[PDB]
């Protein structure tokens, strides 16, 4: 740790990413600034920013750990025992982490598919919901009750609970709007948490596999000599495409983006449907979407119809008003996202031959440049695709959220 910069960078990046995610979680529930809870546009924007930052920093930590393993590892002069023991049973670590992902994926997504099928077949009494088959998150509810009752018993100096999310407190209203109130937990919150766990585990599997097999594997014993960033090792052994650690980070970026997107959708719908709203003069709370998260968020059709279709009517009707920039950015981001697919799906030889024909046509008129045109390298073509993919997806979500929450 004193003779290497990449190990320190990896450690610091991992710690900073975890800290940023914690900061994002801890600011929506305990608002530290005045007139922040009742201003909904800022609350939604501050939660989404730091989540993306934390995810990116974590992926960077994985990449730089792989770089250290490829470059600075030295068993002769810098021998460490624990790293050697971890490297001597890497087959057991990956195979067990591979099993957990399959189990979690099945038991978290097949429940949604079963609910969807039972709904389609006219059998609503066989779904996993609060009315037919209940899967209650009992541990979280016990935690909520304990934290609600902690003041006055285990915290004598406390006059009130730390946050109002734990059930047992009182509603807070500022200027006719709802600031914070207890958040219920039900069967709909049981499934989405396991979705989060499944996605996190898959991302960890990809990144850890890359880091562990950066130096060598059963397929290519001398993978260390080839480098940290190399495309392949030829079509031999049936095909060795994307065996480097750089390609493992490239694959893990997609899964990080997939995992973070579900978190922000969960936050947005749960807060719009269960907390945010308005209070009349007599004390009746009317939420923005009227509490439809409990029943509609248990099937895939509910997210397509009640969330994506219903909440996107604000952005697509912004033309002619002061919010039309969001409507313009909504359509532009789709173009970038679809444009990314040209680099991800295609190869390098076709474009080199096309450029050959183009260069012939240029040579025909004495406008041939002295710097010979070349198509992008194999590694560069991958890097260009993922950048545009992430940019398009994030920009689309950004415009959608900002146009929706400012209007309502």
């Amino acid at each position: 740790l004193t003779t290497s910069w990449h190990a320190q960078l990896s450690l610091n990046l991992a710690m900073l990413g975890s800290l940023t995610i914690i900061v994002a979680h801890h600011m929506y529930s305990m608002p530290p600034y005045p007139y922040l809870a009742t201003d909904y546009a800022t609350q939604l924007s501050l939660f989404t920013h730091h989540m993306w930052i934390g995810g990116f920093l974590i992926v960077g930590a994985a990449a730089h750990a792989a770089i250290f393993m490829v470059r600075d590892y030295d068993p002769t002069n810098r021998y460490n025992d624990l790293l050697d023991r971890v490297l001597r049973h890497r087959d057991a670590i990956i195979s067990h982490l591979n099993w957990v992902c399959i189990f979690l994926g099945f038991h978290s997504f097949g429940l949604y598919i079963h609910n969807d099928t039972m709904s389609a077949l006219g059998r609503p009494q066989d779904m996993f919901s609060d009315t037919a088959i209940q899967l209650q998150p009992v541990f979280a509810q016990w935690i909520q009750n304990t934290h609600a009752l902690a003041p006055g018993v285990t915290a004598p100096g406390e006059t009130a609970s730390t946050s109002l999310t734990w059930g047992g407190g009182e509603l807070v209203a500022v200027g006719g709007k709802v600031a914070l109130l207890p958040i219920p937990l039900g069967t709909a919150d049981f499934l989405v948490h396991h979705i989060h766990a499944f996605t996190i585990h898959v991302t960890v599997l990809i990144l850890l596999k890359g880091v562990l097999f950066a130096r060598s594997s059963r397929l290519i014993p001398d993978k260390a000599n080839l480098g940290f960033r190399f495309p392949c090792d030829g079509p031999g052994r049936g095909g060795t495409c994307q065996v480097s650690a750089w390609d493992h980070v490239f694959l893990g970026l997609f899964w990080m983006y997939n995992a973070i997107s579900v978190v922000i959708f969960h936050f947005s719908w749960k807060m719009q449907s269960d907390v945010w709203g308005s209070i009349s003069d007599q004390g009746v709370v009317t939420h923005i979407t009227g509490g439809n998260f409990a029943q509609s968020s248990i099937t895939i059709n509910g997210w397509l119809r009640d969330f994506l279709w219903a909440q996107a009517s604000q952005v697509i009707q912004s033309y002619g008003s002061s919010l039309s920039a969001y409507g313009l950015f909504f359509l532009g981001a789709h173009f970038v996202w679809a444009f990314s697919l040209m680099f991800l799906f295609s190869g390098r030889g076709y474009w080199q031959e096309l450029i050959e024909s183009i260069v012939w046509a240029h040579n025909k008129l004495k406008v041939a440049p002295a710097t010979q045109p070349r198509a992008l390298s194999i590694i560069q073509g991958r890097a260009v695709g993922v950048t545009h993919y992430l940019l398009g997806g994030i920009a689309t979500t950004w415009a959608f959220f900002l146009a929706r929450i400012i209007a309502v």
Partner: peptide
């Protein structure tokens, strides 16, 4: 000579470990 040099120029701009093998210079940079 070819156009890949332009792309390679910006790809290794901040890779100090490839430029030099001396830890002192990397630390200063």
């Amino acid at each position: 000579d070819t156009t890949t040099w332009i792309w390679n120029l910006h790809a290794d701009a901040h890779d100090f470990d490839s430029h030099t093998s001396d830890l002192e210079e990397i630390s200063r940079k």
